[PDB]
Amino acid sequence: MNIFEMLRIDEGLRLKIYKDTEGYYTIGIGHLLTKSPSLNAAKSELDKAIGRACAGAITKDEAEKLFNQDVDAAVRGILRNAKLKPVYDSLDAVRRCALINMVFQMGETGVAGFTNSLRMLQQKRWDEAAVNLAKSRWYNQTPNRAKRVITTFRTGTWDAYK
Ligand SMILES: [Cl-]
Ligand SMILES: [Cl-]
C-alpha cells in the first residue's frame, strides 16, 4: 500500500466535474477546482489546469497527472511548514502517509490548526491523539474517511485500508 493507493481509495476517481462533499467543484482524484458556486468558474479553472478546452471532462491520464501534482505539493508543503515538518520528521513511514492524507484533503493550513493533536502525535501518544483528532468538524463531516486516517495514526499499520 502506498500513498497513491491510499488516497485513490479515500477520494475515488471521476472524470467529470462533480461536487465534493462540501459542494465544491472537484474532478479526477479529489482535485478541487473551486469553492465558488459557479460552474463556469469551475469550467474555466479546469481548462486552465489541463491547459485545453475540456468541456468539463478529462481523461484518466489527466486525472493522474493532476494527482501526481497534488501529492507532490502536499509533501513539499509539509516539508516547508514550520509546524508540520517536525511532526512529519518524527513519524514512521506509515503514519507519515496519514499526515499526507490529511494535508491533501484539508490543506496545510487546515492541518496546522490541529495543534493539540499534532503535539500528541509528536509525543507518540497514539491513543490519545486518536481521540483528540475525532473531536473535529473533519471527523463529523467525513467520518468513515476520518476514521481510516485515525486508525492509521493509532496503529501504524494499513489495516484500515485492507
Ligand atoms: Cl467535536
Ligand atoms: Cl467519509
Side-chain angles (χ1 to χ4, degrees):
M1 175 89 12
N2 63 47
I3 188 59
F4 288 96
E5 298 177 334
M6 192 199 204
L7 286 160
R8 171 55 162 92
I9 286 154
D10 284 332
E11 302 285 356
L13 174 63
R14 336 232 344 212
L15 294 194
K16 186 107 188 15
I17 299 191
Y18 69 92
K19 303 219 207 171
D20 76 2
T21 124
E22 296 213 37
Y24 311 143
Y25 286 118
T26 303
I27 190 159
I29 307 144
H31 182 74
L32 174 68
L33 291 163
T34 196
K35 289 236 222 135
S36 151
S38 171
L39 176 75
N40 320 284
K43 258 143 116 105
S44 155
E45 287 310 277
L46 177 65
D47 285 355
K48 152 150 100 70
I50 294 313
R52 74 182 179 44
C54 292
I58 63 162
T59 79
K60 211 200 153 83
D61 265 48
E62 294 165 336
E64 293 179 339
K65 186 140 172 71
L66 297 181
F67 189 30
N68 280 344
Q69 297 173 165
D70 297 340
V71 167
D72 187 60
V75 180
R76 291 182 289 108
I78 285 162
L79 289 175
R80 259 198 259 114
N81 183 297
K83 276 102 121 237
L84 313 169
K85 185 175 136 71
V87 183
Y88 192 86
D89 286 338
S90 80
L91 299 162
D92 61 86
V94 178
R95 302 200 169 80
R96 274 168 189 172
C97 288
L99 176 72
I100 297 163
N101 191 306
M102 281 186 92
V103 169
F104 184 97
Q105 174 185 16
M106 77 204 80
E108 186 168 325
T109 326
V111 187
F114 279 72
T115 297
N116 308 320
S117 264
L118 291 175
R119 178 193 101 258
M120 295 157 201
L121 287 175
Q122 229 184 307
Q123 316 159 321
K124 296 195 187 281
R125 312 153 113 56
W126 312 131
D127 287 48
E128 290 139 76
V131 157
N132 184 261
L133 282 162
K135 294 190 50 230
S136 56
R137 184 188 196 266
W138 163 68
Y139 177 84
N140 289 104
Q141 298 301 124
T142 48
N144 279 353
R145 192 223 185 108
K147 281 178 213 109
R148 281 190 296 269
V149 173
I150 292 176
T151 290
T152 300
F153 277 128
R154 222 189 8 83
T155 78
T157 71
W158 291 115
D159 299 345
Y161 289 75
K162 297 182 313 236

